[PDB]
Design an enzyme around this catalytic site. Structure first.
Site, PDB file in Angstrom:
ATOM      1  N   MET A   1      -2.063  19.762 -22.770  1.00 45.90           N
ATOM      2  CA  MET A   1      -1.813  20.134 -21.348  1.00 45.90           C
ATOM      3  C   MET A   1      -1.459  21.645 -21.258  1.00 45.90           C
ATOM      4  O   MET A   1      -0.586  22.111 -21.969  1.00 45.90           O
ATOM      5  CB  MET A   1      -0.743  19.160 -20.827  1.00 45.90           C
ATOM      6  CG  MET A   1      -0.325  19.254 -19.397  1.00 45.90           C
ATOM      7  SD  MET A   1       0.401  17.691 -18.825  1.00 45.90           S
ATOM      8  CE  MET A   1      -0.856  17.284 -17.583  1.00 45.90           C
ATOM      9  N   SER A 156      -3.792   8.935   3.590  1.00 45.89           N
ATOM     10  CA  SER A 156      -5.109   8.548   4.050  1.00 45.89           C
ATOM     11  C   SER A 156      -5.712   7.763   2.886  1.00 45.89           C
ATOM     12  O   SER A 156      -5.116   6.819   2.376  1.00 45.89           O
ATOM     13  CB  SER A 156      -5.877   9.820   4.525  1.00 45.89           C
ATOM     14  OG  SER A 156      -7.210   9.588   5.002  1.00 45.89           O
ATOM     15  N   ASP A 233      -4.150  10.151  15.800  1.00 43.37           N
ATOM     16  CA  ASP A 233      -4.855  10.452  14.554  1.00 43.37           C
ATOM     17  C   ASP A 233      -6.312  10.108  14.861  1.00 43.37           C
ATOM     18  O   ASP A 233      -6.600   8.977  15.265  1.00 43.37           O
ATOM     19  CB  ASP A 233      -4.243   9.667  13.398  1.00 43.37           C
ATOM     20  CG  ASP A 233      -5.022   9.814  12.073  1.00 43.37           C
ATOM     21  OD1 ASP A 233      -6.272   9.987  12.020  1.00 43.37           O
ATOM     22  OD2 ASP A 233      -4.333   9.750  11.049  1.00 43.37           O
ATOM     23  N   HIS A 268      -3.331  13.408  12.102  1.00 43.22           N
ATOM     24  CA  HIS A 268      -3.631  13.127  10.714  1.00 43.22           C
ATOM     25  C   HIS A 268      -3.150  14.213   9.773  1.00 43.22           C
ATOM     26  O   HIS A 268      -3.255  14.073   8.582  1.00 43.22           O
ATOM     27  CB  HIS A 268      -5.155  13.033  10.524  1.00 43.22           C
ATOM     28  CG  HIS A 268      -5.557  12.441   9.212  1.00 43.22           C
ATOM     29  ND1 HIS A 268      -5.261  11.136   8.865  1.00 43.22           N
ATOM     30  CD2 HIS A 268      -6.250  12.958   8.166  1.00 43.22           C
ATOM     31  CE1 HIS A 268      -5.780  10.864   7.679  1.00 43.22           C
ATOM     32  NE2 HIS A 268      -6.398  11.943   7.243  1.00 43.22           N
TER      33      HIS A 268
END
EC number: 3.1.2.12
Lengths: 291, 291
Positions: A1, A156, A233, A268
């Protein structure tokens, strides 16, 4: 990493990492915010900093929510770390939507293990999030818990992945806490979800649909799913339809334990998300035993 | 003034406005957040919601700070409105940097009244911010004070404009409060400032240089300038040089009243700005008599 870039924010540090992913077979980008507790001189040996995983929506990278949701202040407030995964495999070798759209392909993995070629090659986002990434962060940093006392949330497509991971892992207590912002809740019955399922999966869909999953998963104790969604939304009636989870739990052990707060006038957008981040943080903090 | 777009955020509303500007002779974009107090049923007739004006840095539009600084939470916390002006005139008719760079021309007005053609035509950003805009917002909304009990702040080019407006207006008490984030403090002595001054102004520069302005402005009572700057800010040694304001006030009535907090490990970014927004908000709230 690899550490790509570090930013001081609040009393902790926002870290942009990359790593070669075995699930995706590609470089993946991830952000993590480490709270002030991690840099503190006296941090008790008999505590671990628990982790919140925030899953992002369609087209997003880790940086959108990192810059625009202000989780970092909540993180210092309660003493958790927050991880921001990416949303698909990415690279010149990685399949796209043949239709050249944004709702499928890159930035649009839908937190699924794809079985259909050409996507199956890289689109192992379910194993990526629930299996590889926590272990990868664990190997790199280990103060911190990425594996056990962990919460899942997201916006979402991400609230979708959050709910989905929470429920499929529920008998194993894989996640100790689950919330979502404007999630897509019944992918099998909504146009966007059907395209992702047809594309990535080709009966195979049930295993990935929260409204079908929840009905026979035995609810325990006081557990609940926290959802916020705005009534302004623009995706609400075509794609998200939160009411569908409510209907799914009627006459079911989950019945009184899915709380959808439908909030008047809200969007949203990260204006919406940033407004409800404090409440979700305190909800996750309590489920994580921080308060 | 037209409402272009509205977003619920916190308990108030972020409003994207446009208007035909008489100072710039162009359409201008402005955002304003109105706090929860403005929508509240019982707001006292013997109060006005005071305004903070936040000036943005180079290349910015109103939306960057609106999305990335989280002033909106502080605004609801203390009961002020916050206005986010744009950074230059904009349009196909508006002059650019002949060198095609980002530090001059559009997104890069430097809060000055330009005297040199071709810039003089549109680049009246000093009158725009201090004269036209407050009156324009006043005509459109009038609960709110845009003119009297007003604070000024901003980041980089904006902390510059903030300090500059505060000092030039100081004997008239034009602004009741002044802070800045990573400001450019001595434009006459720094490359970026010299290009803006040579370009827009062509002795005319002194009137726009905080380090020259402050020395003969008689400090009153307990007034002070709050500055934050990160010591990992990559623009710090070439452009910003905050130490220069400190040096400017030595042996001067301002001497103990310019507080530069140089903060270890911090950037130029909105990660830096968002971290110090709470402190600046409480500082401005107290100067505005909100607390």
């Amino acid at each position: 990493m690899k550490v790509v870039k570090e930013f001081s924010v609040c009393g902790g540090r926002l870290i942009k990492l990359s790593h070669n992913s075995n699930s995706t077979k590609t470089s993946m980008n991830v952000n993590i915010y480490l709270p002030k507790h991690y840099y503190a001189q006296d941090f008790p040996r008999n505590k671990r900093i628990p982790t919140v995983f925030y899953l992002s929506g369609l087209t997003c990278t880790p940086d959108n929510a990192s810059e625009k949701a202000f989780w970092q202040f909540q993180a210092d407030k309660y003493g958790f770390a927050i991880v921001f995964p990416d949303t698909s495999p990415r690279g010149d070798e990685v399949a796209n939507d043949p239709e050249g759209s944004w709702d499928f392909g890159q930035g649009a993995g839908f937190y699924l293990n794809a079985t259909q070629e050409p996507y199956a090659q890289h689109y192992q986002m379910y194993d990526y999030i629930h299996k590889e990434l926590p272990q990868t962060l664990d190997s790199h940093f280990n103060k911190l818990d990425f594996l056990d006392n962990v919460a899942i949330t997201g916006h979402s497509m991400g609230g979708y992945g959050a709910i989905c991971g929470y429920l499929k892992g529920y008998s194993g207590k894989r996640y100790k806490s689950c919330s979502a912002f404007a999630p897509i809740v019944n992918p099998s019955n909504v146009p966007i979800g059907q395209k992702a399922f047809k594309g990535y999966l080709g009966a195979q869909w049930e295993a990935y649909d929260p409204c079908l999953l929840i009905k026979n998963i035995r609810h325990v104790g006081d557990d609940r799913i926290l959802i916020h969604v705005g009534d302004s939304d623009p995706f609400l009636e075509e794609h998200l339809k939160p009411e569908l989870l409510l209907e799914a739990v009627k006459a079911t052990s989950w019945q009184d334990y899915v709380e959808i707060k439908k909030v008047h006038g809200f969007d949203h957008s990260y204006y919406f998300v940033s407004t409800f981040v404090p409440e979700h943080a305190e909800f996750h903090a309590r489920n994580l035993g921080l308060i």
